[PDB]
Subunit: 316 residues, 2 copies
């Protein structure tokens, strides 16, 4: 058996699906979008029996800026790791993770995160991969808090518009809203969400996938929405193969800090779902939420669908 770098995205896709595809159905198109466009120092290490891939690990170090923010080189990520079901418990996963970890630590990494990377597949250890928690524990990852993807069927329920302060309006993005948007982001959301706007518009995001809330002239919030027309596949629709015909999703969503806790997110959410409903969306996902914000979406009949556990290893 041999460990060496690999770029055979196809064979990686097949191994993924063969082992976990029932709950995380991967496609080559999503896989390549996310691996290829990621801008961090990244690598895929493969484990091989002769010519045959029997395992892999995808790992990154934070080396590229996040909006106005510089990279913190102390952070590394395990994007994913999977050993083939017929080759488990032979030391292969350990070998593969030792190699990834060794390389990251030599490049200055002190904190290793399970998922949560840019172009992540997972916000943390999926609950479907709960048995791997013990594997990560042995290696010195600490199991921390949970995150949830939520699911709902926006076709099935009708809601009363929450009552609305005057001056505010909410509309899908027009191309001339764009300078307005980036100013607002530079001001209120200048790390990861600013960066994602930047990169995502370069690889097929359209204004129609964006909803904006205004106080008179001014942009004070956004949501990113998804349907079967979106060409950029974002987290909410990663697992669209499970979601049926007329799938959708929503996230992120953000209101300028000075405008929060006055019902405006509720209004943005309502209208963002209204748009999706009018587009005939049925089942849709809201990705990567915290336990404390679930009921904000629950008011609209969303429920937790997947769970992920944050996990972090501190290098000695």
């Amino acid at each position: 058996m041999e460990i060496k770098e690999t770029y055979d995205f196809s064979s990686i896709v097949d191994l993924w699906n063969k082992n976990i595809g029932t709950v995380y159905p991967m496609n080559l198109e999503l896989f390549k979008q996310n691996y290829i466009n990621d801008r961090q120092r990244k690598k895929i290490m493969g484990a091989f029996n002769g010519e045959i891939l029997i395992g892999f690990v995808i790992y990154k170090q934070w080396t590229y800026k996040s909006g106005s923010l510089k990279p913190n080189h102390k952070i590394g990520y395990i994007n994913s790791i999977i050993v083939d079901i017929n080759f488990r418990h032979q030391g292969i996963g350990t070998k593969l993770l030792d190699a990834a970890e060794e390389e990251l630590i030599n490049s200055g990494v002190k904190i290793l995160r399970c998922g949560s990377d840019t172009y992540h597949f997972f916000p943390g250890i999926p609950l479907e991969c709960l048995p791997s928690e013990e594997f990560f524990l042995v290696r010195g990852y600490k199991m921390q808090d949970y995150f949830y993807d939520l699911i709902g069927d926006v076709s099935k329920v009708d809601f009363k518009k929450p009552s609305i302060k005057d001056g505010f309006k909410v509309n899908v993005m027009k191309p001339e809203d764009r300078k307005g948007l980036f100013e607002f982001l530079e001001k209120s959301f200048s790390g990861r969400w600013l960066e994602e706007f930047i990169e995502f518009f370069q690889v097929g995001m359209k204004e129609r996938d964006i909803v904006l809330i205004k106080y008179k002239t001014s942009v004070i919030g956004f949501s990113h929405i998804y349907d079967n027309k979106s060409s950029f596949i974002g987290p909410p629709i990663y697992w669209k193969a499970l979601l049926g015909h007329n799938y959708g999703g929503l996230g992120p969503i953000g209101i300028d800090k000075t405008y929060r806790k006055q019902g405006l997110g509720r209004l943005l959410l309502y209208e963002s779902l209204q748009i999706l409903k009018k587009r005939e969306v049925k089942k849709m996902v809201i990705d990567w939420t915290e336990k404390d914000i679930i009921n904000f979406y629950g008011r609209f009949n969303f429920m937790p669908w997947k769970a992920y556990r944050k996990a972090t290893k501190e290098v000695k």
Copy 2:
């Protein structure tokens, strides 16, 4: 808003599906099967706006024997409780649960369980219902351990002893199965075999492992021809075509930790595989046992939290 007893199953099922059908798709056949066949003292209390059902609770007291076990009347169950999404946070859940708990307690119940009943829909509070834990916590329920339904696709992967034989049950096995059950699994699983056979379970849904001519273990398996709809295939609308399941599975205590469970499992999966099963579920497992199924590529799919209230 009126609280009173209902048996309008169709209304209940519709409300069910409107609120949680995305993750727990209910059909009227399953609903009726489980409600009508349960032998406990049971009731459904509905919440109504005029003639319109806007919430319900189903609840049960353990009043009927479980195999060799006598009923313990101290145990009650909240089978399910749902208030419609447009009527939440007005006290309806509270009134329904209060009515259920008041009746159970007046009948001698001292311990209230969320799910875990005979003909349960849930082994405990689903993770999809995680926001309800607050509602129950405030009302005195303690949140305990998790259990999991596992999922796997037997169509996707291939895998690889003296006097041990595994085969689909034959009708002549009836007696041996019963004797075995009475010896090794003489509570709830014994009760299930008795009751399931009287309501449509066939010999083809049972796999037996024998040492010589002695039954020493069994599994119950499910496909799209089973007429008994048991927990592994409750949520078959989510599993695609050629769905199946497995559970329970058991080996005589005497014979465990020697690979015989593994073999019974292997052969049971083989049989399902040969029946053209794809996506299938293993219901209600403990964390400590997930890896036993995991060797065959099964993964946690749904989680449920055990929750218990002690009446004070």
